[PDB]
Every structure is written in C-alpha cells, then in structure tokens.
Amino acid sequence: TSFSNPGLFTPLQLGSLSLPNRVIMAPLTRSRTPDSVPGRLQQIYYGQRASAGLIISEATNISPTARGYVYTPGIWTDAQEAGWKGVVEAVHAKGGRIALQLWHVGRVSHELVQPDGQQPVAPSALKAEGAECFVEFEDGTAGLHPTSTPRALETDGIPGIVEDYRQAAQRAKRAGFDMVEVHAANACLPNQFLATGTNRRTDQYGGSIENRARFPLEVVDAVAEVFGPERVGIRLTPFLELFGLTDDEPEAMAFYLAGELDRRGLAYLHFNEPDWIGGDITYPEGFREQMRQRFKGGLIYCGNYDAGRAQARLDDNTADAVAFGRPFIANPDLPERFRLGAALNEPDPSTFYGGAEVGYTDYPFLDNGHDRLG
Amino acid sequence: TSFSNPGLFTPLQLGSLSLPNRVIMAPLTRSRTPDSVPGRLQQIYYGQRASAGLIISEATNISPTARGYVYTPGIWTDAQEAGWKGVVEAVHAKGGRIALQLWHVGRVSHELVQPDGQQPVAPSALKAEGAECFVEFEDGTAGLHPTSTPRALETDGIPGIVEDYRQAAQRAKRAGFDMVEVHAANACLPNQFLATGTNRRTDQYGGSIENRARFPLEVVDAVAEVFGPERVGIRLTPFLELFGLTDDEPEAMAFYLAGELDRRGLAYLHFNEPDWIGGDITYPEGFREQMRQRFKGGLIYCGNYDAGRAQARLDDNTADAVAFGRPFIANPDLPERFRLGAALNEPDPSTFYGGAEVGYTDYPFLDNGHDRLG
Numbered sequence: 001t002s003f004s005n006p007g008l009f010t011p012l013q014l015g016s017l018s019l020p021n022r023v024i025m026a027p028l029t030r031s032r033t034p035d036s037v038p039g040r041l042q043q044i045y046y047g048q049r050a051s052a053g054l055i056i057s058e059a060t061n062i063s064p065t066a067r068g069y070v071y072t073p074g075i076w077t078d079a080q081e082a083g084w085k086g087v088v089e090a091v092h093a094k095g096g097r098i099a100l101q102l103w104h105v106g107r108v109s110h111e112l113v114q115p116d117g118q119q120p121v122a123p124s125a126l127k128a129e130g131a132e133c134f135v136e137f138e139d140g141t142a143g144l145h146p147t148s149t150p151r152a153l154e155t156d157g158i159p160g161i162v163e164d165y166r167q168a169a170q171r172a173k174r175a176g177f178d179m180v181e182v183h184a185a186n187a188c189l190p191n192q193f194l195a196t197g198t199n200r201r202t203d204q205y206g207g208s209i210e211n212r213a214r215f216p217l218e219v220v221d222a223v224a225e226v227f228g229p230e231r232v233g234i235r236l237t238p239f240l241e242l243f244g245l246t247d248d249e250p251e252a253m254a255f256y257l258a259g260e261l262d263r264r265g266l267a268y269l270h271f272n273e274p275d276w277i278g279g280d281i282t283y284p285e286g287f288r289e290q291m292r293q294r295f296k297g298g299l300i301y302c303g304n305y306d307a308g309r310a311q312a313r314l315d316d317n318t319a320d321a322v323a324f325g326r327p328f329i330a331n332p333d334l335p336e337r338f339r340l341g342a343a344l345n346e347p348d349p350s351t352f353y354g355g356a357e358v359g360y361t362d363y364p365f366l367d368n369g370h371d372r373l374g
Numbered sequence: 375t376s377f378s379n380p381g382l383f384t385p386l387q388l389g390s391l392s393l394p395n396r397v398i399m400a401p402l403t404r405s406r407t408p409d410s411v412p413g414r415l416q417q418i419y420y421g422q423r424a425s426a427g428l429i430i431s432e433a434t435n436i437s438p439t440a441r442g443y444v445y446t447p448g449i450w451t452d453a454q455e456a457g458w459k460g461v462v463e464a465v466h467a468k469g470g471r472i473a474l475q476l477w478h479v480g481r482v483s484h485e486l487v488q489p490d491g492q493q494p495v496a497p498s499a500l501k502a503e504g505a506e507c508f509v510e511f512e513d514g515t516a517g518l519h520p521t522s523t524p525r526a527l528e529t530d531g532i533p534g535i536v537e538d539y540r541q542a543a544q545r546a547k548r549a550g551f552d553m554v555e556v557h558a559a560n561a562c563l564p565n566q567f568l569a570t571g572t573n574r575r576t577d578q579y580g581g582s583i584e585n586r587a588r589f590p591l592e593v594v595d596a597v598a599e600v601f602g603p604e605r606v607g608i609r610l611t612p613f614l615e616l617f618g619l620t621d622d623e624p625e626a627m628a629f630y631l632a633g634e635l636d637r638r639g640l641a642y643l644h645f646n647e648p649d650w651i652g653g654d655i656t657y658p659e660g661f662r663e664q665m666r667q668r669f670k671g672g673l674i675y676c677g678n679y680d681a682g683r684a685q686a687r688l689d690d691n692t693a694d695a696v697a698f699g700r701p702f703i704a705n706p707d708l709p710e711r712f713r714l715g716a717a718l719n720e721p722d723p724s725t726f727y728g729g730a731e732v733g734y735t736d737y738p739f740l741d742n743g744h745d746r747l748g
C-alpha cells in the first residue's frame with residue numbers, strides 16, 4: 001500500500017521539500033559568468049526553467065582552489081552570494097525550487113586556472129590521464145587544456161576543505177537556496193577519495209571503504225549541519241570511469257554510502273548513470289533494487305532519459321524522480337513538453353560552454369496559442 | 375529567533391506543503407465551464423499562473439444542490455473529476471501547487487439554477503435580501519437574478535451535506551490536488567451557519583457560538599480525514615456583511631474557530647478582509663495580532679493588496695502569505711511582476727464571468743526580451 005503509481009507530474013516529498021513534479025533539472029556547467037558572480041542572465045536562464053520539479057544548479061566552486069573551469073560561479077565571496085540571492089529570488093518568483101551543487105574539481109584542474117598558479121590538490125599525487133579542463137590563457141583566449149599533476153592533500157589539510165564546504169553551505173542558506181547537493185560524482189574531488197584508483201592515501205582517509213568515504217561523509221555532515229539532512233542531497237557515479245578515474249570497489253562503496261547516508265537521513269541520492277547511448281558499461285543487474293532497499297530517502301537517476309524510460313523507473317519503484325540535463329538545456333519547459341508529448345528543441349553542443357545568451361536563454365518555449373508576451 | 379524577515383519571494387511551509395513564494399492566487403469564480411467539467415481551457419488558464427506560491431481554485435460545487443452560479447465547475451461526478459485531473463496535472467507540469475475550494479452557495483441560489491427546480495437550502499428559512507445569483511434562463515440567455523427564499527435544513531439532513539463535502543474531498547485527492555480549502559466565507563452555506571443573522575436554528579447546530587460552528591467544523595473534520603489537516607485550509611470573512619448576511623458575534627466566532635482549528639492543526643486560515651478601497655468597515659485594532667497568537671498555523675489574508683502592503687503584513691508578523699484575486703486575473707505572472715516592480719495589466723471586469731478565452735487566458739506575460747514562443 002506504500003508504493004502507489006506515481007507519474008512524471010505526481011508531486012514528491014524530497015526530504016522536507018515539496019516538489020510539483022518529478023522532472024528534475026540536472027546540474028549543468030554553462031560557464032556563462034565571466035566573473036564568478038551570477039547576474040541577471042542567470043536570473044533569466046534559471047527562471048525560464050522554474051517549472052522543474054527541482055532545479056539542481058550548475059556546479060559551483062566552494063573556493064578559488066576548487067576551480068577547474070573558467071567563467072564558473074563561485075560561492076565563497078559576498079559578491080557571489082549576493083549574485084546568487086538574485087538568482088534564487090528569481091527562481092522563487094516563478095514557482096521553482098533550487099539546490100546549489102557544491103563543487104571541488106580536485107585533481108581535474110591546472111595551475112593556469114588555479115589561483116596564483118597554485119598546484120591542484122587531490123587525495124593522491126596522481127595526474128588525470130587525458131583529462132582536460134577549461135582554462136583562460138594569458139593572451140585572453142580560453143579553451144581545453146590538459147590537466148596537471150596534483151599534490152596529495154596533507155592529513156591536517158582535509159579539515160580546511162570541509163570548512164570550505166561548510167562555508168559554502170552557510171552562504172547558500174543565507175542566499176535563500178532551498179537545498180544543497182554535495183557534488184561527489186564525475187570524478188571530482190570527493191569522488192577521487194572514494195575511488196580506489198585515485199585514492200592511494202595511507203592515513204585515515206584512505207586504504208579501506210570506510211576510509212575512502214571518511215572525507216566525503218565529513219563534507220556531508222558539515223553541510224547537513226547548516227541545511228539539515230532533510231534539505232541535503234549528494235551526487236554519485238559508482239561504476240563511472242571519468243577523467244582517468246578507476247575503481248575496484250564500485251558496488252561495495254555504493255552499498256556502504258547508501259547505508260551511511262540513509263542512517264543520516266539525507267533527502268536524496270542523485271546517480272548519474274555510467275550508461276551512454278553510444279558506449280560505456282552498465283549497472284549490475286539488481287543494483288537499482290538494492291539501492292532502493294538500502295536507502296529509504298529520495299532516489300534520483302540521470303542519463304540519456306526520455307519521458308518513457310523515466311516513467312519506467314518510477315513504475316519499477318527504483319527511482320522517485322529523474323533528472324534531465326541536455327534536454328533541459330534546449331527546453332526550458334521540458335516537463336510541459338513531456339505532458340503534451342510535444343517535440344523537443346534540438347540541443348546545440350557548440351554553445352554549451354562560454355558565450356552569453358545565445359544557446360543559453362534563446363531556446364523557445366512551447367506556443368499553446370494562448371500565451372502572449374505583450 | 376523564531377520570526378525571521380520573510381519576503382514575498384521567501385519559501386513558506388504551508389502545512390506539509392512547500393511553497394516557492396508567498397504571492398497566492400485567491401479563489402476566483404470565472405464561469406468558463408458551460409458544463410461543470412474543466413477542460414483544456416482551464417489547463418491553460420491555471421497553467422499560466424502556475425508560478426503562484428499556491429493556486430486556490432475557483433469555488434467548485436460539491437453537489438448539484440450546492441450550485442448558485444451557472445457554468446461553474448463541479449466535483450461530484452467522474453467526468454468532472456477527470457476534467458480536474460487534467461487541470462491538476464497541467465498545473466504540476468508547470469511547477470505549481472493547487473487547492474480545490476469546496477463550494478456550497480446555501481441560500482444564495484434560485485430554483486432556476488437549482489437542479490429540478492428544487493428549493494435552495496440553508497440553516498434558516500431567510501431570504502438573502504438584494505442578493506443575486508448567476509442563472510441561465512429558459513430562453514438560453516443568462517444573467518443576474520434575485521436569490522429565492524430557502525428552506526431550513528432538517529437536523530437529520532446536515533449529515534448528508536457533510537458527506538457531500540467528504541465525497542468532494544475524496545475525488546479531489548484522487549484527482550491529484552495538493553490541498554482543499556473549505557469555503558466558509560462570502561456568505562456561502564458554511565458562513566450562513568456561523569453568522570447570527572442567518573442562523574436562527576434551535577437544534578444543536580445553532581443558538582450559540584459552539585452550535586453555529588458545529589456544522590462548519592464537521593465539514594472541516596470530514597475533509598481533513600481525507601487530506602489530513604496538514605493539507606487542509608479554510609476561508610473565512612468575520613466582519614464581512616455580504617449577500618444580506620449580518621453577524622452580532624464576529625470576533626467571538628473568529629476567536630473560537632481560530633482556537634478549534636489550531637487544535638486540529640489546520641494548514642491555514644484564509645481571511646478575505648471586509649475592507650474595500652471604496653467603502654466598508656474594517657478589522658478591529660488588534661484583531662490581526664490576536665489571530666496570530668490564537669492560530670499557530672499559516673495565516674493568509676486577501677483584499678485590495680499590492681506588493682508593498684503585502685510585505686507590511688509579513689513584517690508585522692500578522693500574515694505568512696497574501697492572496698491576490700483580480701491582479702492574478704489580469705497578470706498570470708504576478709509574482710514576477712512584483713519582483714521587478716513591473717507595471718500590472720489592467721483587469722477587465724466585463725470578462726470576469728462567462729465567455730471563453732477572451733479576458734481569461736489572453737492577459738499577456740512580461741516580456742524579458744529573452745523568452746521566445748517559437
């Protein structure tokens with residue numbers, strides 16, 4: 001009697017927050033902020049997509065050291081916090097809910113993008129092979145550049161990183177954000193500690209499942225003290241090998257985190273599927289079922305999802321909601337388009353990063369023949 | 375430390391429901407449904423205003439006997455319930471939350487609009503002087519018509535009315551509605567029992583404050599069993615003399631209800647101020663403060679409110695949110711207009727009732743210079 005038959009437009013209680021639908025906007029880096037301060041353009045971009053059951057913001061740098069991509073928003077400065085407040089306010093004025101995703105690129109960075117040409121930090125001094133990051137060269141030009149070799153974080157340095165996360169959450173709550181999502185996927189800093197291939201530490205923050213998750217859980221606890229676990233989420237990518245990251249214990253870690261995070265009572269777990277409509281490996285048969293039983297809170301999945309496959313996960317009772325990235329980039333009113341089964345706008349990869357409003361806020365809404373912009 | 379400084383765009387926990395902002399859409403009869411079944415036109419109308427922190431639907435007839443205005447929606451038939459589900463789904467697809475307002479006009483009706491020319495019911499057989507209702511005459515024409523003389527409801531007939539309310543709530547919950555609002559204002563059936571001038575009953579449903587509120591509270595309890603008090607609201611108009619209704623104990627009743635409703639843990643109390651920018655009396659000095667102390671749940675006020683006066687009530691800590699009627703009729707994106715301080719569209723009283731899409735879904739949205747309806 002517990003499990004009903006929810007649909008894409010069935011409201012959902014995600015932690016202590018009420019969502020109008022289950023069509024979530026996945027976190028998407030757009031590099032549309034030359035200065036790390038969100039402005040009116042973001043107010044327009046995010047506002048256009050306020051119909052999302054929940055908007056997960058673009059990854060946002062918790063500090064200068066956490067940056068790996070230029071023109072990305074920050075959240076360690078008053079100017080940035082004020083910039084976000086205008087964005088958060090804009091989303092609310094249109095009926096939406098927004099979560100700020102706390103970002104730290106870890107080893108996926110370069111001295112050029114790093115402040116004062118400082119060396120990128122990470123759990124182990126292992127370079128990310130073939131990995132590239134977005135940097136602005138000395139001649140004012142910007143583009144992809146190979147990631148450099150990071151330095152292993154000193155054991156006594158980890159508490160500082162956690163504090164940076166805590167500080168970001170504190171500015172986020174003060175800015176009016178409904179929730180915060182700890183970015184621990186796509187091979188960023190937190191993910192680097194979790195994966196065996198990237199974590200070779202011999203202190204208490206590496207060596208075993210419990211150690212590799214020690215720092216990530218400290219971050220989670222840190223932000224949950226500010227927002228309360230009911231308003232905190234975390235993104236994960238178990239069997240995902242991205243930016244040269246490899247893992248020998250994907251499942252064992254996913255199961256352990258699920259249990260630790262469920263005990264903490266987190267609002268949700270956001271999974272970015274390793275899948276790809278053109279390659280990649282896939283989740284182990286029975287992985288989704290296990291997560292559902294191990295984590296009682298909200299389960300969000302993302303990756304090459306359409307209306308039909310999304311509903312399937314809802315029916316299988318292996319997901320509570322589904323996030324959409326690219327489709328939400330090209331369709332500000334994606335949820336409505338799914339309700340009417342309307343055709344979707346075609347995403348333009350060329351304008352996913354950098355630039356201004358073109359390929360950002362120029363994707364058209366559906367025309368019902370009644371709405372007027374007079 | 376409890377009371378912070380909420381703004382019009384500050385999220386609010388209304389019962390167990392999360393609102394994105396505090397700019398509420400007041401319930402507004404539009405008579406845009408020839409048959410009592412909401413259709414696509416309503417999907418468009420309500421969807422255009424999905425940005426509302428919360429949309430309180432147009433008063434909806436809980437039964438044929440409860441009708442006093444033609445072309446008004448019902449909620450006692452499967453066809454109607456299915457019609458509403460499409461509307462509720464449309465609102466959700468755009469990020470909104472909607473509450474169905476349960477309506478019973480009581481003595482404010484006529485045999486012509488009443489099914490099978492039945493005589494309008496009420497607590498006492500007292501006609502509403504000068505009162506008029508919207509009726510469709512035999513020649514297919516429709517217009518204002520004097521209300522007729524009602525018959526006093528038999529004591530054993532009251533349980534049936536309550537059941538009609540319970541049934542309406544049950545179809546409402548099944549249709550996906552986020553909440554239900556018991557209409558007990560503007561001199562409708564529930565209000566008629568509460569007011570001394572309209573309730574002359576000598577049984578247990580009249581004679582004293584406790585008796586006059588007996589039926590109304592039975593209705594509230596009835597619907598709260600379906601939605602849970604956390605998802606139930608009630609509309610009231612204490613010092614309001616409408617449709618020939620008069621009251622000798624406005625305050626005493628408002629205080630008593632406040633206490634009884636607070637004990638029940640209702641999500642909110644929605645007050646439609648007796649005020650009028652052109653006449654009328656006003657709330658007693660210190661009335662708002664009292665309500666705030668007597669009712670700990672959500673307090674919503676409505677009536678000739680603008681952005682500035684609305685914020686004032688929030689600052690005075692005498693309201694948690696403010697509803698807007700006419701302004702929401704002429705401005706589908708009212709909340710956004712208040713954020714930007716943009717000018718508001720001019721309401722057209724001529725098209726408030728009856729008709730189709732003109733004066734209904736043709737009010738333009740703001741043009742930020744970026745949105746496109748391609």
Ligand SMILES: Cc1cc2nc3c(=O)[nH]c(=O)nc-3n(C[C@H](O)[C@H](O)[C@H](O)COP(=O)(O)O)c2cc1C
Pocket residue numbers: 026027028029030058059101183185186235272302303304305323324325326327352353
């Ligand atoms: C341009 C672009 C920017 C992205 N930025 C982020 C980000 O900042 N954080 C993150 O966790 N994922 C990021 N992603 C991944 C998406 O959130 C998403 O998980 C992925 O696109 C798969 O879903 P989709 O098929 O619906 O797009 C990005 C993807 C694209 C295409």
Ligand SMILES: Cc1cc2nc3c(=O)[nH]c(=O)nc-3n(C[C@H](O)[C@H](O)[C@H](O)COP(=O)(O)O)c2cc1C
Pocket residue numbers: 400401402403404432433475557559560609646676677678679697698699700701726727
């Ligand atoms: C055309 C019209 C229809 C209305 N219908 C309803 C209704 O069905 N139920 C109700 O409780 N109030 C109804 N009202 C009253 C409004 O909800 C509101 O309380 C009133 O308009 C005062 O607020 P305002 O100054 O923001 O318009 C209606 C008002 C107008 C103008």
